Structures are given as C-alpha cells and as structure tokens.
Amino acid sequence: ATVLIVGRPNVGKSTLFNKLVKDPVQDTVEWYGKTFKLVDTCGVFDNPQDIISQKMKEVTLNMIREADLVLFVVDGKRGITKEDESLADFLRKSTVDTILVANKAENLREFEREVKPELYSLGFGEPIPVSAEHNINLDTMLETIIKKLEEKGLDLESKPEITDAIKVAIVGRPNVGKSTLFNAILNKERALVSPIPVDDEVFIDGRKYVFVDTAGLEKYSNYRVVDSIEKADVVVIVLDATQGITRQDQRMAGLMERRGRASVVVFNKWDLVVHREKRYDEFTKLFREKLYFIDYSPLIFTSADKGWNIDRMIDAMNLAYASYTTKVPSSAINSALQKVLAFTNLPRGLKIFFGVQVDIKPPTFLFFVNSIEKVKNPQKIFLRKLIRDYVFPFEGSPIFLKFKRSR
Template identity: 45%
Template sequence: MKKVLIVGKPNVGKSSLFNRLVGGRRSIVDDVPGVTRDAVYGIVEWQNRRFEVVDTCGLFSEPKDIIEKEMWEVTLSFLDDADLVLFIVDGKHGITSEDLNIADLLRKKNIHVLLVANKVENKEKFLKEVLPDVYALGFGEPMDISVIHAKNIDILLDKIVEILRLEPEIETEKQIDENQVKIALVGKPNVGKSSLFNEIIGKNRSMVTPIPGTTRDAIDEVFEFSNFKYRFIDTAGIRKKSAVRMRTIESYSILRSVRAIEKADVAVLIIDSTVGITSQDQKIAGLIERKGKASIIVFNKIDLIDRLQREYLKSSIKEKLYFIDYSPLIFTSTVTKEGLNKLLKTIKMVYESYTKRIPTSALNAAIERMMFVTPTPTVRGKKVKLFYGTQVDIKPPTFLFFSNFPQLIPESYKRNIRSTIRNSIYQFPGSPLFLKFKARG
C-alpha cells in the first residue's frame, strides 16, 4: 500500500489534517506545540482508492531535550519509506526559519513533496501576505486548505490519488481487519511497552526514553510471522486516575489507550518484573476482562531479576490476578530477546481460543455430568434448573443457557460452569468466557 507522510514544524495542523483524512480522532490535537510524540498510522479511502497516511512528530529545528531529539530521529527514519510527503506550512502566520530548514532537508532526501498551506481561512490575505514567502521553499504552487473548515480537502485527496497513480481497490477495510489479529500492548507507564513493540516489529516506531509517559498516541503496525498477520498497537501508559488531571493531553492519551483495548482482539498486559503486580496492574487487568478481550500476562525486564524472583511473580498471579488466571504467562526481555518468539506464538494460540466454537452436544454432555456431581442450587426456596445450553458467539466465546429461574443462578455456580467448560471440553487459554441465561419460553 502506498504511504503518505505528513511532516512540518510543530503546531501547523498535521494531526488535525490526519484526523480529517482518516475520519476520526486518531491523533491527539492541542494548541501546545509537540503534542504528537509518535508516528500514528491510518488508512484513507477515497473514490474506491486506499492509501496509508502517517502523522509524524513535529520537526524541531533545534531539538532542546532527549524527547525532541528522539522525535526528530523517528520522523527522519520514515522519509526513506514514503511514496509522498505532505509538507504542511502555516498559511495564516507565514513562513519561518523552521520551514526553510525542513525544506532543505526534504530536498536532500530527493522524495516527492506536495506543499500544503493550512489555516487558509482568509484567501485574500494568504495571497497577498503569505504566498510570496511560500514560493521561497522551492516546491512550487502550494495547495491551500483549511482543515478546521474542511476547505479543499477533497481537492487535496484528488491530488494525492493522482500523484500516487492509485487504482481502484475491491477489498474493504472490514475484510482486511478480519484477516488480522489486533493486539493492544497495555500497562502502566515505563514498563517497556514501546521497547517491546519496537523489538517485535524490528523498527523504531515508538519513542523509547527513560521518561515515563513518552508514548502519547496509540500507534500500530502490521507484522507477519509464520503466515499469520498481527496488528500491534502500542498504547500510552495507563496511570491512576488520581494522578492524571482531566482534559489534559495525558488524559486524552489514556482515553485513547482504553479505546485501543476496546478495538483489540488480544490485550497483552505488560508488567515490570522489577516492581511486580501493583494495584494499577490489577485495574488494567480488570478493564481487559470487563471488555471481554483475550489476554496474555507478560513480565518484562526479566534480565534484571533472578530465578527466585521469577517464581514469586508466578505465584503472585493466583493472588492478585486471579480473575484472569486463564491468561498465559510469558517472561520477556528486550535486552536478551527472551520470550519474544514465544509471545508471538502465544498470541496466535490465544486468538484461536478467542474465536473457538465447541459443539452443542459436547457442551450439554459436560454440563449434565457437572450437575450430577454438583446439583443446581435452591435459591429462596426455588429449585433452579438448567435445561440446555449452546454457544452463541465468539470474541469472546459466549454461551447461552436456558433455565427456569435464570435470575437466581448464583455467581458461584456460574464459576462452576466456566470451570467445567475449560476442564472438560476446551481450556480456552487466554480467553474469557461469557455466560448468558434465559428463561425457557
């Protein structure tokens, strides 16, 4: 698929344009320069043609700290892979030395550049005061747009399609999604999510620094391993609510991470093995379970602990993460590369479990044996009966049981049903099991 890169100095509307093109708030938008810290990918569909668009970090002319330097390096790494670069400038306030420096950089890269002037709400002012300086960038006539007013976006899309010489495609985004397993890498800040993400895909897609909260956007990458396609999503770290001010960039990042979990098939909960399971890890695990997502528990940074500590971490799962104890456990290290291939194989296994269907006959035979050993309870003087059950859905596997008093079935008996399904029919490793009960009509 052809790739279009959006570049420019900070705060010229790159993320706003990205969101407009992909049709949603995929990138975080704020008036503070440098909000986008990670490259964010999206698919654009226009006139039966599709291309990939990448919202990059802002290019600072003189990076002031480790984060701005890392943002600069990440953006530069994408230029060699781009089929087209949209160079965004401020059509309202004009050209600065930062724009000139970026123009010099793009010319040296010898790539196709389409110059785009954003924030052109006043065309007359733009033509008189800004356009002459824009020509100095050396990329010819700019396309003037206004993202906020959706002005000339259709013309911009037509131009992109023309430059890329895109042919109409038949396959839809929904069909493509069905051919990929979507994985969200989640956890607290600074547990090594981005390092693990970069190691798996073999690219420096996420910024990696020792500063907690470096990743702000949920970014993704399609990766193929053993003829199986994975779409990995590296999310921002999820901190305690009390530690995050509302309506801040970080709060938006956390909301984006929660949405990434909702869209994922498999959530990989990454825990810092040097710290162990914390209350925040428990809350994230609870969120994964409530959303009905398949899950894998990963203890990262195991190169920093000994074997005795590993055994303690294993035993702590039964106490602190008992509600997702069906999740496979993997120890990983991006330093020694331990556990990386095992993680990919486990994701495939868990996804197959998440989409598994079992025969109705096997289900009812197992439940009958269970009821012979553990009869249905009597609640409030009423004898509860289970007549039969069937699997009605996947992602997660969902089972519907018919009963005379469905509302009276206690949680303890529901746990017994889940245990019977796992132990007698199929273990469903990594997948939650949802149960529904209905009165027989």
C-alpha cells in the first residue's frame, strides 16, 4: 500500500513524515507488524490550476492516483489559505481517498474555535487534529489510516511473493575461488541443488535460483563470462583479496554495468590477508576507487575455504535482485527531483521537468527535459544519485536513464 502526504509549504509535512517513519521523501511506516510506503510529495502538486497541458494534467492525476490514500495536511493554527483550496480542488477531482489532517493543533480548544469550522469547506469532512512536532494524536491518525487501507482490501502484512527464478552468474579471474564459493553455498543447509527431474537449478531458503554456466564451477575468448553476464539477473564478481583489483576485474565490472545487471562484489581469500581485521576501510576504498562503475554493489568479505560470510553473500544476492526488481512511485521521483533542484543549478540552459520509472531489470527512469544534448554525464550521475539518496537506495542495482525532449 502507498500513502501520499500532500499539502502546501510549511504545514509540517516533513516533520509528520519523519515522525511516522521514525532527508528522503519515501520510506516505510510500520504498525504492529503491518507496513505501508509513505511519500512526502513536497510541492509536486502545488498550483494545479496553473497546468495548461491536458497531457500534463492527466500525467499529474495519474501520479496522485498511484496512492491508495492521501494525507491532506493543512495548518491548524494559520487556517485555510488559497493554496489549500486549489490543492483541495485537485484532490477532489482525482477522486483518490483522502484524510484531512490539521497539523499544529496542539491547542485543541483554540483549534476547534478558530480553525476547525473553516476546514470543513475543503470538502473532506472533519479534519483530524494532530501535532507532528509534539507527537500528539499521531497514533489515532495512524489507526485510522490502517483501517481505511484494510477496508479497501489491501494487504499490509505479507511481503510480495516472487515467481521467477533468480539467475545468478559467478565470475572472476582464474583461481580467485569461484568454484570453492559455489560449493560453499551448496554445503549450507539453506541451499539445495534441485532434486526435480550448462546451468544448475538451486533452491535456497525456499526460493528458486538458476546458477548460470556452472560447468566451470589458456584464456582468450572468455565467451562464457560475457554469455553468463548476459543470461544473469545478478552477477557476483569474485576478487582475490590477496591480489587486489586488476584491470581485467575492472573490465568485467564495466561489462556488468553496461549490460545493466545487478551485482555483488566479493573479496575472497580474506583469511589470507594479514592484519585483515584492521583493513576493512582500506579494501572498501580500493573497491570504491577501482570499481566505482558498480559501487552500488554490496561488498562482502569472504573465505570460501573457511566458510566465512557465505551467508552474507547469499543475502546480498537477494538484496541486489530485490532492488533490481523494485518499482518506485512517480510522485516520489518528482518530489525528490524538485527538492534537490530547489538548491541545485543546472548548467547550460537545461531544464528537467519530471520523470517516471519505465522498467525494471534494471530499474529504468525516463526524464522529460527541454534539451537532450544539454544532458551530459554529470547530470546523469546527479539523477541516479538523487534517486538513491531520496527515493530508494537500489542497493545492488544499476539505474538506467532515458530522456525525452519536451517543451
């Protein structure tokens, strides 16, 4: 389920957001084991009456309709303003279920006397008085949100069930420990080579995986490496911690990123590294400087020989795949974009109007801009980073960008 916080500037949306999720514009709220996604839409829907284009109005309406519920926040001390009225009109038009929340209403007696009456004119019934800053009545509001979501038949308890097998490729230079690592996985009770009558179907934790080109688990073509990367969803690149990161490792990483595969980076033979426990920062910096191409990848320190961190490697593959298949609300993408652009000046005459996610495997976003030629590498790095920083980290997954010229 997804809940959107809507409201004009300075009504306390950020404070309310931070209080509910316990800065990003999207996060999760937990309630007695039940959860839902929360999005502070910031100013994405401000001045809706100023949208001239019918297409743009329809796109904006679809953004709000992504929500199962909207928390329409107004200022309980100041009262109704023209901006609250325009937002109210847009929300009513959208027909999306909405809860009117009057923040800054700690002084209940004054609120009901001076402001509550006028709030009825917004068309959403009686407002729920709360105080995000003083943590007042937030529990009653939450209970109300949960009830409404459940009444709509939404499941706030079960985590989405995966249907496809997760294809994994284990790659790396000869002798780094690929074969040993693959067998280390198979030796654990949580894994099992499918008993059901060049790949291997493997079950781990009750989930289905396909480890590609397992036959291997002088060199000239490396056709298997390229083929394996293409076939996989998640690619585990294994490095020999005693050797560091070679140029060939960098080439494989570049290939992984260009093909848009999820990934996990493993420093194996960690047991052979001297004074190893005092060198995590050193190796992490090496990973960041040599493999920045795929720095979104979890970095696991393993010993395939001693059986160190095989579990962390498996969990990392699961996390990478989860990010690889994650979809985020367009309201969140645009809320983040507008929040950052507020204090960011784009070069040349570049303008980035809005964006939306258009695919997964890998997560791919389309941004509408005034000029495609004005979008250079720094702006692409900038867009991927704001998504990771404010929307969802997408740990383990690359983020692809597409652009469309518009006026």
